[PDB]
Structure formats: C-alpha cells, structure tokens
Amino acid sequence: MGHHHHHHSSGVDLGTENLYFQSMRAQLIERGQLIAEQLAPLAATALARKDTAVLNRIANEALDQPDVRAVTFLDARQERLAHAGPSMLTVAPAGDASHLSMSTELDTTHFLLPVLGRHHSLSGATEPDDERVLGWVELELSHHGTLLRG
Fold first, then answer.
1. Residue ranges making up the domain that contains 39
2. From the centroid of its chain, how far is CA 143?
3. Which run of H or E residues covers position 118?
C-alpha cells in the first residue's frame, strides 16, 4: 500500500540512518523506500516478488520471533542467505522477539553444517536468479500484518 508520496530517496543517505532503530529500520526502508516511501509492507511484497535480499533481514528479525514455524533461503552457489525457526536456525534459543539475535548475520554461510533447508526437491523460488535466488526458499509462518505474537 505504498501509495503516492514526495519520492526521491531509495535508501540510506549517510550510512547510519538505520543504526538508530536496528536492522528493523534497515529492512523497512530497503523495501518500503524502493516501492514508494515508508508505507509499503516489509514481508508481503518481498515474498510475493521473491526478493531474498530483504527477506534475509526480515527473516532474522521477524521470522526469528516465537509465533513463527520455519524459514530458509539459498542460491545456486550453495550459499544460505538466511534461516529461522527451531529446525532451521541452530542458534535459535527463542523466548524473545528480536533481542535474542546474538550472531546470525550474512557471515552465517551454508558451509559444511549438519542441516540445510527442509531436504525438499523444489519449493518457493522456482524462478531463476533474475528474481533473486535460484536454489530454494522455505516459507512457514502466520499470514503477516502484525498483531500476531506467541
């Protein structure tokens, strides 16, 4: 629901605008200020268009919450972009919203880990690298739009 606005902004114009409000401001601006200005949804549009670039950040902040079932993201290169929920994220102690996020940045590559994805053949990003990722993405959670917490 991005609508009309002033426009002409894209993202951060100083390198530390998001840092005042955590990765939550980074991901809200990264999608909402690409679509319009500070009004379009963070996850609903990003999942519909399959933009794993921002789906990583919103997963490690919002799919990391105790209401969530399961999520994962990987490209053709055998690189995990993200992972969240109890069976995907090995570093999920749960119990908090975002404050549990101790060390689960993009540096958490797929590598030689003991688990990956949901061991499925193909689901989520059936589209090629022209969307964002060709490998796969899992999606299992509440219908979004806020007001839904464990």
1. 1-150
2. 15
3. none
Among 41, 59, 64, 56, smallest CA distance to 29 is for 41
Q: How far apart are the first and last CA of the chain?
A: 27
DSSP-derived secondary structure for 40-52: S-SSHHHHHTT-H
Looking at beta carbons, which pairs linking 85-93 to residues 24 or more positions away fall under 8 Å? Answer: 85/140, 87/115, 87/118, 88/115, 88/117, 88/118, 88/138, 89/64, 90/114, 90/115, 92/64
Are the C-beta atoms of 135 and 120 separated by less than 8 Å? no
Measured CA to CA, the distance from residue 88 to residue 93 in angstroms comes to 12
Amino acid at 66: P
Using alpha carbons, select from 9, 44, 50 the residue that is nearest to residue 30.
9
Three-state DSSP state, 73: strand
Structural domain count of the chain: 1
